[PDB]
UniProtKB/Swiss-Prot annotation:
GO terms for molecular function: arachidonate omega-hydroxylase activity; enzyme binding; heme binding; heme oxygenase (decyclizing) activity; identical protein binding; metal ion binding; phospholipase D activity; protein homodimerization activity. It comes from Rattus norvegicus (Rat). Induction: Induced by its substrate heme and CoCl2. It comes from the Eukaryota. The record marks 131 as: Important for catalytic activity. The gene is Hmox1. It is a single-pass type IV membrane protein. This is Heme oxygenase 1. The chain holds residues 10 to 223 of 289 of the full protein. Keywords: Apoptosis, Endoplasmic reticulum, Heme, Iron, Membrane, Metal-binding, Oxidoreductase, Phosphoprotein, Transmembrane, Transmembrane helix.
Length: 214
C-alpha cells in the first residue's frame, strides 16, 4: 500500500501464512513441541535478538530508525538471558547451541545494521510485531504443554511488562513506521527485506524441525 505499515502488511501476507504453517509452528500450535525443541528455538532467538538489539543500539539515533526505538517496552535480550539461565543453567553461555540457520540470520542482521541501517525497521517489524501477536498465542500453548511455574520463569521472552495493551501498542508502532522518511524506492527495499526476514525465520523453523525429527 502507501503507508509503510500497510505496504509491509501487504508484502508479507504470504510469507506470514507460510511461516505459521511451517511444520514446526503447526506442531507448536497443536501443543506438540517438546522441551528439547522449545529449548532449541529459544536458544536461537537469544542469538537473533542479541544481534538485532545490538544493531538497534548502534542505530538508535539514526533518523532511518530512531522513531522505532523502544528499549524499555520491546527489547528481549535480558528476558532471553533469564530464560537461558532457566533452561540451560548458570553456564548457558557455553552450553546453548548456535545452529547454521541462526548464524545466517544473525549474519544478515549485522550486514543490515552495519551497511543498510535504513532496512533495520523491516527486521524489527518482523520480530517484535509477531511477538505481540502470534507470540502471545504461543505463550499460552507453551504454558499448558511445558507446565512451567505460574510465576513466569522460562517464558520471560513472551512477557512484556511495559505493554499492558499489545493491540494499542502495535497501532502506535505502525504510526511511528509511517513517520520514517524514505524515497519510494527505499520503501520497496524495506518491504522486500521484510520478506527476507520472514524467510530467515521460515528456514530456521525448517532447520530446527529437521534437527528434532533427526
Ligand atoms: C505461530 C503462528 C502464528 C500465528 C497464529 C500468528 C498470528 C498473527 C495474527 C493473528 C496477527 C494479526 C495481529 C494484528 O492485526 O495486530 C499477526 C501479525 C503479525 N505476525 Fe504472526 N502469527 C504467527 C507467527 C508469526 C511468525 C513466525 C512471524 C515472524 C517471523 C510473525 C510475524 C507477524 C508480524 C510481523 C505481524 C504484524 C502484521 C502487521 O500488522 O503488519 N507471525 N500474527
Amino acid at each position: 500500500s502507501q503507508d509503510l505499515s500497510e505496504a509491509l502488511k501487504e508484502a508479507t501476507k504470504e510469507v506470514h501464512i507460510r511461516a505459521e504453517n511451517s511444520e514446526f509452528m503447526r506442531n507448536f500450535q497443536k501443543g506438540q513441541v517438546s522441551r528439547e525443541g522449545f529449548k532449541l528455538v529459544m536458544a536461537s532467538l537469544y542469538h537473533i535478538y542479541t544481534a538485532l538489539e545490538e544493531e538497534i543500539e548502534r542505530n538508535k539515533q539514526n533518523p532511518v530508525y530512531a522513531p522505532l526505538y523502544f528499549p524499555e517496552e520491546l527489547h528481549r535480550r535480558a528476558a532471553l538471558e533469564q530464560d537461558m539461565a532457566f533452561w540451560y543453567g548458570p553456564h548457558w553461555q557455553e552450553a546453548i547451541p548456535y545452529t547454521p540457520a541462526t548464524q545466517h540470520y544473525v549474519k544478515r542482521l549485522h550486514e543490515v545494521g552495519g551497511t543498510h541501517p535504513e532496512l533495520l525497521v523491516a527486521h524489527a517489524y518482523t520480530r517484535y510485531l509477531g511477538d505481540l501477536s502470534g507470540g502471545q498465542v504461543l505463550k499460552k500453548i507453551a504454558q499448558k504443554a511445558m507446565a512451567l511455574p505460574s510465576s513466569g520463569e522460562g517464558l520471560a521472552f513472551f512477557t512484556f511488562p511495559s505493554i499492558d495493551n499489545p493491540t494499542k501498542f502495535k497501532q502506535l508502532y505502525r504510526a511511528r513506521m509511517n513517520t520514517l522518511e524514505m524515497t519510494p524506492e527505499v520503501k520497496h527495499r524495506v518491504t522486500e527485506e521484510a520478506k527476507t526476514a520472514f524467510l530467515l525465520n521460515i528456514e530456521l523453523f525448517e532447520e530446527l524441525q529437521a534437527l528434532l525429527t533427526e
